[PDB]
Design an enzyme around this catalytic site. Sequence first.
Site, PDB file in Angstrom:
ATOM      1  N   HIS B 120       0.842  -1.271   0.120  1.00  0.00           N
ATOM      2  CA  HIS B 120      -0.231   0.063  -0.068  1.00  0.00           C
ATOM      3  C   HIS B 120       0.852   1.312   0.010  1.00  0.00           C
ATOM      4  CE1 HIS B 120       0.698   0.941   4.223  1.00  0.00           C
ATOM      5  NE2 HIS B 120       0.597  -0.241   4.741  1.00  0.00           N
ATOM      6  N   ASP B 121       0.483   2.240  -0.720  1.00  0.00           N
ATOM      7  CA  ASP B 121       0.987   3.484  -0.970  1.00  0.00           C
ATOM      8  C   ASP B 121       2.517   3.676  -1.338  1.00  0.00           C
ATOM      9  OD1 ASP B 121      -1.217   5.066   0.356  1.00  0.00           O
ATOM     10  OD2 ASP B 121      -0.692   3.668   2.073  1.00  0.00           O
ATOM     11  N   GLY B 138       5.184  -1.142   2.131  1.00  0.00           N
ATOM     12  CA  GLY B 138       4.137  -0.128   2.530  1.00  0.00           C
ATOM     13  C   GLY B 138       4.830   1.222   2.532  1.00  0.00           C
TER      14      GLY B 138
END
Lengths: 256, 257, 257
Positions: B120-121, B138
Site C-alpha cells: 500500500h502507498d 508499504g
Amino acid sequence: LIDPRAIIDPSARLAADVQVGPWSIVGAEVEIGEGTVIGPHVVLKGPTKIGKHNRIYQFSSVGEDTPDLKYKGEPTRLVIGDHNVIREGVTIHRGTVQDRAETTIGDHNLIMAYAHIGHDSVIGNHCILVNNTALAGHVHVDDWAILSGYTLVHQYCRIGAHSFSGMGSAIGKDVPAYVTVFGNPAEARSMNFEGMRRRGFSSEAIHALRRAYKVVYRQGHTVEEALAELAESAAQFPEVAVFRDSIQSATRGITR
Amino acid sequence: SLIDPRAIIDPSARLAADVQVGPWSIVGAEVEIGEGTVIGPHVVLKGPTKIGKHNRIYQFSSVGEDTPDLKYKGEPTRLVIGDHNVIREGVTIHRGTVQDRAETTIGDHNLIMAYAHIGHDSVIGNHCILVNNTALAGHVHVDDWAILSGYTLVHQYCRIGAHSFSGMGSAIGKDVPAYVTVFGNPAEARSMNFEGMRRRGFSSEAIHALRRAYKVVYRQGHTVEEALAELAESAAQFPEVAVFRDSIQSATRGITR
Amino acid sequence: SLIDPRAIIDPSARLAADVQVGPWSIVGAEVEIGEGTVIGPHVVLKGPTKIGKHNRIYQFSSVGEDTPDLKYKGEPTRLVIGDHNVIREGVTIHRGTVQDRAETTIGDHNLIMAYAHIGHDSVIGNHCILVNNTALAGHVHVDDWAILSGYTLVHQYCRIGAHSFSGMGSAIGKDVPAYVTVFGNPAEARSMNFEGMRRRGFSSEAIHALRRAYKVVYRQGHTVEEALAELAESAAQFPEVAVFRDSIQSATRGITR
Ligand SMILES: CC(C)(C)OC(=O)N[C@@H](Cc1c[nH]c2ccccc12)C(=O)Nc1nnn[nH]1
Ligand SMILES: CC(C)(C)OC(=O)N[C@H](Cc1c[nH]c2ccccc12)C(=O)Nc1nnn[nH]1
Ligand SMILES: CC(C)(C)OC(=O)N[C@H](Cc1c[nH]c2ccccc12)C(=O)Nc1nnn[nH]1
C-alpha cells in the site's frame, strides 16, 4: 451466494450465508461455517473443516496433501476456526497419521499472501503470518505471535505467545513467548514490549518479563538454572508463567 | 474477439482500444485499462484502479487488492499504473490507504517479476526491475532504473535510490542512496552500480565523480551534513552526482551503511 | 471424459490417450503430454514444450512461459520435462533462449514444491528435490539427487553438484560441488551430505575417500588447480571422488567455500 461457475462436491457441507466465488472448487468432505467468504480461484480439498466469518482469497490451496515422502495417502484432517483472513496464494496442507493426523488453525489469524502452513502445524489465535512465511511441518504457533515476511520455521519448532520474528528470519529452535528473533540463523534480540502494551499488561507484569529475559539470556544461567530462578515470578504473574512454560516445553533448546 | 467471454467485466470498468482479457479474469468495478494492455488469464483486477497503455499482466496476479495490514479498509483508495509495464505471474499490488497517500503509484517501462509484492502507498518510478518475490512493505519509493534482486525485502517508508541495486535475499531497513549496491540481511552498502552507469551511457568523468562521491559519504567519517557540503561542487558540475547528493539529503531516517 | 470440458486444448496439442486435465487449465500450441500425466485445475501449459509420462502438475502453475530476460526476443525455444515428476502449486518454469541451447530441461523423478522457479535454459537431472520457493535464475544445472531447501536462490550459470544439499534460505552465487552441504546468504560450505549418502547406500570406503577429498579442496590451502592435481589419484580410484573432482573441474563461477 454460491457462484454457478464453482464446482461444489456432493460430500461438501456449506452452512447457509456462505459465499463461493467463480472457478473455486469446494472438494469432498469440506465443511464451511456461516459467514465465510471463499473467493474466486480457490481450491479447497478435504477432509477439512472451516468455521465462521473466514475469508479465503484467490489462488489459495487449502487442504492439499503434503508432498513430504513420509505420507502415503492416509485420510488426514485440516481444521480452521473463525474470523481468520487467508490471503492470495496461501498453501495449507492437512495432517499426517505419524503425528496427530490434524493441521489446526484457531481464530482471528491473519495469514498473508503465499504463506505456507505445513502438515500437522498448530496455529493458535490472533497470530499474524506476514507474506511468504513458511512453516515446515509440526510447527506450533501460540496466540498473538507475529512472523514477519519470508520467516522460515524448521520442522517441530515451537513459536511462543507474543513472540516476533524479523523479516527473512530462519528459525531452527524454539522461540520462547514474548521473544523477538532476527536473521538466518535466527538469534534472540529482546522482548516484544509493544505486544505486551497491546494486551494492556500491567507495568509490573512488563517489568517481571523484562527481568525474566535477563535470567534466561544475559545472566550466564543454564536453562534448568533459569527455570528455577523464574519459578516464583511465574507463581506470582501468569504472564511470566507463559514465558517459563515456553522454555520448559522446549526440549530441543531455545533460540539464543 | 479480444475480451474472452469467460472473463467477468464489471459494467463500471472502462476498456480502451486493443485491450485483451484472457479467460477467467476479473476486471472489477472502477478498473480503467488503457490502449493495447494485455490482461492474461486467471488475473484479478480490483478498483478503483487506472492501468495505462501497452501493459502486460500475467496469470494469477492480484492487482488492486486492499492491504491486510488494516482490518477495516478505506474507500476510495487508488492504484495508478502507467505505460509499457510487465507484471509477471502471481504478482500482488495493493491500493493505497486513506491515512497516507490514498494511492499506490507505478510509472512506465517497469518489469515486476513473478510473485513480487508492492505494498500500500508505495511509488515505483520508470525503468525499474523487481526480480522474483521482491516484497515492498508499504510507502516504499523506488526511483528510476533501480534493480531489486529476487527475494529483496524492503521495510515500510524506505527509499530505493535511482540506478541502485540490491543483492538477492537483501533485507533493506534504511534508505538506499542512488547508484548504491547493497547485500545481505540486514542490508550493507558495498559499492556503486558502475555496470548500470555504463549501460545508461554515463561519461567516465561522471562515473569517476560518483566513485569519489561514495568515499565522501561512506569512507571518511563525515556527518551527512558535512558529506552534503563536501559534495556540493561535484553536484553542481554533474547532474549524476546531484542525484546521489539529493538521495542522501532526503534520508531523514538515515542511509544504508 | 479425462479432459475436463472447461479446459482449453489447442488443436496443435499432442496428448497421450489417458492424460487427465482438470478444469480451467490451458494446454497451448505445440505442448506434448505423455501417458499417465495428470494436469490439475487452473494450470497454464505453454509450448513449445514436451512433458513425458506419469507426471503431476498442480494448480496455479505456469509451465513453459517466455523468460522476462531482456536478451530473449520471441525466438522458437523449448521446455522438456521427463517422467514421474511432481510439480506442486504455483511453480513457474520458463523455456530456453537461443544464446544458450534454446531449451530448459527437467529429467525424471524430481519433486518441485510450491512456488519454486526454474529460469530459462536451466537443466535439472533426476531425483532432485526443490523445496518451496527455491528460485533458479537461468542456465542453472542441478545434478542428480540434489536437495535445495525452501527459499534457496541460485545465481545464473551456477552448477549444483550431485547429492548436494542447501539449507533454508541459502543464496548460492558460486558452484556447489557434488555431496557438499551449503547454508546461509551468502552460501558457505559446511561439510558433505553423509546423511544423504548413508541413506542411498554409498560404501563406507567411498564416504571415507569423499571426506579426505573434502579436506584436499577446502582445508589444505590448495588453489583449485593444486586441489584437482592432488585429487587426480583418489578420483582415479573412486567414481564418487571423480564426480566430486569433475564438479570442481567444470566450475565456471568458482566453488562455494
Ligand atoms: C517483508 C515485508 C513483507 C515487506 O514486511 C514485513 O515482513 N513485515 C513488517 C512489519 C509488519 C507488517 N505487518 C505487520 C503486522 C503486525 C506487526 C508487524 C507487521 C516488518 O518490517 N517486519 C520487520 N521489522 N524489522 N524486521 N522485520
Ligand atoms: C522453508 C521450509 C519449507 C519451511 O522449510 C524447509 O525448507 N524444510 C527443510 C526440510 C527438509 C530437509 N531435507 C529435506 C528433504 C526433502 C524434503 C524436505 C526436506 C529444512 O528444514 N532444511 C534445513 N535443514 N537444516 N537447515 N535447513
Ligand atoms: C533470486 C533469483 C531470481 C534466482 O535470482 C536473482 O535474484 N537474480 C539477480 C539477477 C541479476 C544480476 N544482475 C542483474 C542486472 C539486471 C537484472 C537482473 C540481474 C541476481 O543474481 N542478483 C544478485 N547478484 N549477486 N547477488 N544477487
